[PDB]
């Protein structure tokens, strides 16, 4: 293949949309659409600019390009590629054509994602759009003209290259610098233990690890949400730690969880570090000062050691928040990465059944537990788990899902605490056992025979991998084997964590497929109601694959899948043959298509009762006392989804729900330009305009494209006076501009009736839509509301009383008001409590700016009529009376016993502490209740 010398020329984006353009007339030997190497070289490595190998695709000029450009052989779009080339105009370059593409497919093409939410199915679609396309380093790509992306690494044959080619077998990896990160600080006895250099390990954690990682986050300009929670196991026995057997966990223990920082953006790192340091300084007083019922406090309790700590309980506490795939969407962040900070060296004594359950749970969800150890690297292979079997047999195993990093000439790698700290007094560790007394053999009758017999015998004598002994090393190939199979296709993990890879190159063997598997078969077909819209079998098929990628399936391509398919063409992206293989730890899905439209789906489905119940004590950010947790961290799990009904509803309903988000619009300040167009009149005009804008977003077929009042609800119900629907049904088109190639349909429920004192509710029920389109639709609605003096804000769908039993890291506090109206005789009346049972609590919430949420509540009622009440999205399953702040930052809830609930709105995210102090002050609550009585009388 000859090298073709050529000139250089630039052009603006107004004339062409491609990157590198050639002339097909000037190069007749090069077919269009072929991978063509570009290099400025004279067969020499001329410093750094002489070695610049850049790939592109052979594309011809345009009419304006041919009419304008005459002396330039190559027209390259200005910008990033011009800066990378660093060449002046009319420079002599060379052109080489490579007719083979599969040999030049790059192994790894990285992709960095910022400030937006991209699902794994969206990553699969983006990689489907990147088939047969050449990329270079630091190239700012795009996706639906709103999702940017920087390619920070291209790899081929173990070598980093500036430019590469993306093919079908290109293992493209998507990483996110906008991600939710959870830090679990493992508070043990060794956090205050000194290292051989002379530093306590928590001093390392707060002075060398967190400031450096925050500096690295700021340097890359990542926008994360950190979540820092303490993690304490407390030993309740008086037995010494030297008497503990290796392999057995602690029989008597209490486990604590102090959530220091909730879901908080990392731009508040000063406040994050201040809160972390304050809570770590206060945790000793919080835990080691127990309260005795005799009226005083006794300094009691002991932290468990690292080896005997509740490590698998901490990992299950971390995996509590990913059990439900259909939770609330963090529309600005992508990856859920958990980091465990420990003062140990990767040695943990664990229970066997709990280890099995932890492995089975971690193989069924998208987390990478990156353990970081503040001690030096030990002499054994890390991470090391010691457990005792049913026959009290010690074993050693290294888990695949845990990766150990160490934070930092001979270095002491073995820890002897009693000799480093000199904890044993010199007179009491004097050697007791000495050399033996030269015992005989009872076969020796001579001293020379004894010497000869002494001189003759003087020189005599799938979630874990079982290590034979920690004192013998492993081979290089075995140490290369230690990596998870679901993450086999991957400082960079700390700063820019990676999502679950779209592909996996592993599969069960032929004997294992017939050993512990059961077979379920589907047959799903197009329905005539959905083909009125632009819906073939293909886009429905890739919507099903989008749902599978959302749940956690990876598309199997490799050797074992090919060798097991022929024992009856494998595919990775999307003709009529679409044979994909999707696998999780629970079930394996084989999906095949045809020209008829029928999609054949075969499900190969594959412990929780042999683990004791475990309810720890959880302290959130706004609590002052340790309270019992509302969820079992071990026994909650990622349930096997009912895929038959999923395929039925994507084809076209108890115990089933999709992705969902409730939206609350609230009255706020009016802009001054709006007044030049009653504040209540312009606010209801803005509400009507928003309703009209929603009803103008109705998704239409291709065939067709060719009450206000004030007061309680029951008063208005009986004023205008069986099922009365309070909401309307509507199926909107999320994307009207047609950016995506699929159907983006969502279901909208809006309130039929409205009060200025009642919150207005917008519902969004979507299954397979792109979340960025939902996010920009919500932004457009928020701008429309803010133009008319409203404020659209995003709120949890589930009730506030249910958040601890789902998300244990969320803040949640118990509010017990000081002045009880039903007990204190200063404010007591039979008529007032008969007319309004919760009058004082409602007035207290209203005086602090808390709007009411549940208008259909039966705790603030006066009469009952309309037996059956229902919303258009279903029945209101609300236990208490929820309240929303007018700023929408915090959520309140009023019970039947007068006790309040209180929790912030972390999805959207001073006043919270003000309201907590107001509820817990005699003077403020007395003044508020006196004002309430004065308003009641007058």
């Amino acid at each position: 293949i000859k090298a073709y010398q050529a000139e250089l020329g630039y052009h603006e984006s107004r004339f062409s949309e491609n990157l590198v353009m050639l002339n097909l007339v000037e190069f007749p030997d090069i077919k269009p659409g072929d991978l063509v190497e570009l290099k400025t070289y004279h067969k020499n490595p001329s410093a750094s600019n002489g070695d610049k190998k850049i790939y592109f695709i052979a594309k011809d000029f345009d009419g304006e390009t041919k009419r304008r450009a005459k002396t330039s052989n190559v027209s390259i779009l200005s910008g990033q590629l011009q800066t990378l080339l660093d060449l002046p105009s009319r420079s002599r370059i060379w052109i080489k054509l490579k007719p083979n593409k599969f040999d030049l497919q790059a192994d790894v093409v990285e992709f960095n994602i910022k400030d937006c939410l991209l699902n794994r199915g969206d990553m699969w679609v983006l990689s489907s759009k990147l088939v047969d396309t050449c990329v270079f380093m630091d190239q700012r790509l795009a996706f639906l003209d709103s999702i940017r992306g920087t390619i920070k690494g291209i790899y081929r044959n173990g070598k980093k290259i500036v430019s590469g080619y993306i093919g079908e077998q290109t293992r493209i990896i998507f990483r996110s610098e906008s991600a939710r990160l959870i830090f679990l600080i493992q508070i043990t006895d060794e956090m205050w233990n000194f290292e051989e250099t002379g530093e306590q390990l928590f001093q390392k954690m707060v002075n060398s690890f967190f400031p450096k990682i925050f500096k690295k986050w700021k340097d890359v300009d990542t926008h994360h949400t950190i979540t820092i929670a303490f993690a304490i196991s407390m030993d309740l026995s008086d037995t010494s730690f030297k008497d503990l057997t290796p392999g057995e966990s602690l029989k008597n223990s209490q486990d604590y969880f102090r959530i220091v920082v909730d879901q908080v953006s990392i731009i508040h790192w000063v406040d994050i570090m201040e809160t972390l340091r304050e809570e770590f300084m206060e945790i000793r007083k919080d835990l080691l000062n127990k309260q005795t019922d005799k009226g005083y406090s006794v300094a009691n309790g002991r932290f468990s050691p690292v080896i005997k700590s509740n490590f698998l309980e901490l990992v299950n506490f971390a995996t509590t928040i990913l059990t439900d795939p259909f939770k609330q969407l963090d529309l600005r962040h992508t990856t859920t990465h958990v980091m465990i900070i420990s003062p140990g060296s990767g040695l943990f004594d664990v229970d066997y059944s709990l280890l099995r359950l932890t492995g089975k749970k971690l193989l069924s969800l998208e987390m990478t537990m990156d353990l970081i150890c503040l001690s030096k690297a030990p002499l054994h292979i890390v991470p090391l788990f010691r457990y005792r079997d049913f026959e009290n047999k010690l074993h050693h195993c290294v888990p695949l899902w845990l990766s150990v990093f160490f934070w930092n000439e001979w270095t002491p790698r073995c820890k002897i605490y009693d000799l480093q700290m000199m904890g044993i007094t010199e007179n009491e560790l004097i050697r007791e056992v000495d050399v033996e007394y030269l015992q005989l053999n009872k076969k020796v009758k001579s001293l020379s025979e004894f010497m000869n017999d002494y001189d003759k015998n003087a020189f005599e004598v799938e979630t874990w991998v079982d290590i034979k002994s920690p004192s013998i090393p492993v081979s290089s190939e075995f140490a290369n084997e230690l990596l998870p199979i679901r993450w086999k296709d991957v400082w960079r993990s700390f700063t820019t964590p990676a999502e679950l890879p779209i592909t996996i190159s592993d599969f069960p063997s032929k004997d294992d497929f017939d050993r512990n598997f059961i077979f379920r078969n589907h047959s799903v077909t197009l329905n005539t109601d959905q083909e009125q819209y632009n819906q073939t079998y293909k886009d429905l098929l890739r919507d099903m694959i989008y749902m599978r990628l959302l749940t956690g399936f990876q598309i199997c391509v490799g050797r074992q899948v090919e060798k097991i398919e022929l024992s009856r063409v494998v595919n990775k992206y999307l003709n009529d043959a679409f044979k994909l293989y999707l696998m999780i730890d629970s079930e394996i899905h084989r999906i095949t298509c045809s020209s008829s439209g029928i999609i054949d789906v075969e499900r190969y489905l594959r412990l929780f009762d042999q683990v004791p119940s475990y309810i720890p004590l959880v302290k959130t950010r706004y609590e002052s006392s340790f309270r019992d947790a509302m969820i079992d961290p071990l026994h909650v799990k990622r349930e096997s989804l009912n895929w038959n009904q999923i395929d039925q509803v994507l084809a076209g309903d108890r115990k089933w729900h999709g992705f969902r988000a409730k939206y609350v619009v609230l009255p706020t300040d009016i802009p001054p330009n709006t007044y030049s167009m009653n504040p209540e009149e312009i606010r209801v005009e803005g509400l009507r305009r928003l309703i009209g804008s929603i009803t103008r977003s109705r998704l239409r077929t291709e065939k067709e494209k060719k009450m206000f009042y004030t007061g309680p609800l029951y008063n208005f119900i009986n004023e205008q006076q069986p099922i009365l629907m309070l909401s309307n049904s509507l199926v909107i088109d999320v994307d009207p501009a047609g950016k995506s190639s699929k159907q983006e349909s969502c279901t909208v429920h809006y309130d039929r009736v409205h009060n200025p004192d009642h919150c207005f509710h917008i519902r969004l029920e979507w299954l397979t839509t792109t979340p960025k389109l939902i996010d920009d639709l919500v932004g457009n609605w928020s701008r429309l509301c803010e133009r008319y003096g409203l404020k659209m804000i995003e709120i949890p769908w589930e009730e506030l009383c249910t958040i601890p039993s789902v998300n244990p890291f969320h803040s949640f506090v118990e509010i017990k008001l000081a002045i009880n109206p039903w007990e204190d005789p200063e404010f007591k009346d039979r008529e007032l409590f008969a007319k309004s049972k919760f009058y004082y609590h409602v007035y207290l919430l209203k005086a602090s700016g808390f709007l009411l949420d549940n208008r259909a509540s039966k705790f603030l009622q006066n009469q009952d009529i309309e037996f059956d009440i229902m919303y258009s999205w279903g029945k209101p399953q609300f236990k208490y009376v929820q309240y929303i702040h007018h700023t929408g930052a915090y959520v309140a809830e009023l019970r039947e016993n007068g006790c309040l609930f209180l929790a912030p709105n972390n999805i959207y995210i001073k006043v919270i502490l003000n309201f907590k102090s107001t509820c817990l002050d005699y003077q403020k609550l007395r003044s508020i209740f006196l004002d309430a009585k004065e308003m009641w009388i007058t």
Partner: protein, 402 residues
């Protein structure tokens, strides 16, 4: 053990008058001792290349240890803020245990100044921009001079936790398979949960007469990790290496044999050590078929000689040990432990079943490296006579008992 601090002072770079001392405990200690800060003010606040480095320099009879810190941010005047927590020590000492403490103090104050602007706001003067220092210096000074430890809270979440640790010599790499370890302490009672599992396996086999290969085979351990664990135990000054006891060994008295005489409690320990608890059966075996006095033990210690093996020495003096009920192994071990005798190692330099290929390869590698008989016997797991027979089959060799 640890040198007391001479003067602690906190120097900051003022944007108007340059580098200056803000607070200093003891008060006017530098001027009373003739230490002028303006002489070395360009080392306390140097250019940012020298900053964030452990700087220690000598000024007369005093050694001045500092960790200069410079933070570049537009919030401060002149686009940077510089401070230095400076420690003064005498010259004739070792400031090595104090250097990590000063380095970590500087790094922690760098973190605090970068986080919440502590030291810049502590001046209470709005010229540095666009909790007591003196009490902290007093507490650091007196706690490190009286306790070698401190816990001084400076905020609601921040405290100065400094502990001064001694510096230990690194272990040697000369430990090998033929060396036997002697535990100088009772290692069973030191074992807590933080010990290495390999070391925990090694502990019940350090009896003073087992080789490292024998301990590795007994504990099912790789010899390299046993070597590293013995090195770590050497690093904490608790295990001393020795030799395998054989009757083919050659022992000779050392230069410290008079310490058996010039010590009031060595000979009594020898009497209580070398004797069998009862009338042992070894004290009834023939050569072929009260406690012993200290003069007898000394005469037995002298009678060892170079080139004379322990078999010949024991068969020349066997009535003495039989009548006095003396264990010869315990006698040799006490002699080696008090450094009054030494072993002359045997070196087989050059000019029966069929031996294996790997066995002959490691035998040839041991011969070509001039290794001792002990190392070859350990590596082949064979006695001395089989190794000697194989070597005589392979060639002619001479033995040096050095």
């Amino acid at each position: 053990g640890f040198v007391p601090i001479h003067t602690i002072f906190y120097s900051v770079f003022h944007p108007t008058e340059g580098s200056k001392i803000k607070y200093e405990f003891p008060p006017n200690n530098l001027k009373n001792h003739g230490i002028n800060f303006n002489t070395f003010k360009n080392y306390i606040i140097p250019k940012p290349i020298l900053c964030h480095k452990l700087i220690t320099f000598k000024y007369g009879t005093y050694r001045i240890v500092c960790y200069p810190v410079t933070i570049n941010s537009p919030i401060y005047a002149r686009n940077f803020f510089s401070f230095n927590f400076v420690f003064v020590f005498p010259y004739d000492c070792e400031t090595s245990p104090y250097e990590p403490a000063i380095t970590r103090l500087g790094k922690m104050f760098k973190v605090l100044e970068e986080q919440n602007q502590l030291l810049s706001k502590s001046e209470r003067d709005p010229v540095f921009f666009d909790f007591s220092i003196q009490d902290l210096l007093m507490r650091i000074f007196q706690d490190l001079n009286n306790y070698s430890e401190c816990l001084i809270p400076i905020d609601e979440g921040n405290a100065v936790d400094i502990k001064i640790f001694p510096l230990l010599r690194p272990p040697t790499t000369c430990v090998s398979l033929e060396d036997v370890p002697l535990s100088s302490v009772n290692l069973k009672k030191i074992i807590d949960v933080n010990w290495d599992p390999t070391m925990m396996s090694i502990v019940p086999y350090i009896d003073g007469l087992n080789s490292i290969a024998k301990i590795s085979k007994l504990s099912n351990s790789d010899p390299g990790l046993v070597i590293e664990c013995i090195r770590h135990l050497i690093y904490y000054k608790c295990v001393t290496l020795s030799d395998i006891f054989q009757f083919s060994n050659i022992y000779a008295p050392s230069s410290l044999i008079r310490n058996f005489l010039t010590d009031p409690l060595m000979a009594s320990d020898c009497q209580s050590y070398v004797t069998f608890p009862e009338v042992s059966k070894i004290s009834n075996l023939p050569l072929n078929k009260f406690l012993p006095t200290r003069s007898c033990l000394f005469d037995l210690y002298r009678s060892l000689s170079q080139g004379q093996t322990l078999k010949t020495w024991y068969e020349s003096k066997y009535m003495i040990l039989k009548e006095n009920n003396i264990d010869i192994r315990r006698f040799i071990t006490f002699g080696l432990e008090k450094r009054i005798i030494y072993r002359c190692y045997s070196f087989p330099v050059m000019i029966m079943p069929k031996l294996s290929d790997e066995e002959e390869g490691i035998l040839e590698e041991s011969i070509r490296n001039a290794e001792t008989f002990d190392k070859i016997c350990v590596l082949l797991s064979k006695p001395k006579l089989e190794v000697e027979s194989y070597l005589n089959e392979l060639g002619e060799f001479k033995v040096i008992n050095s």
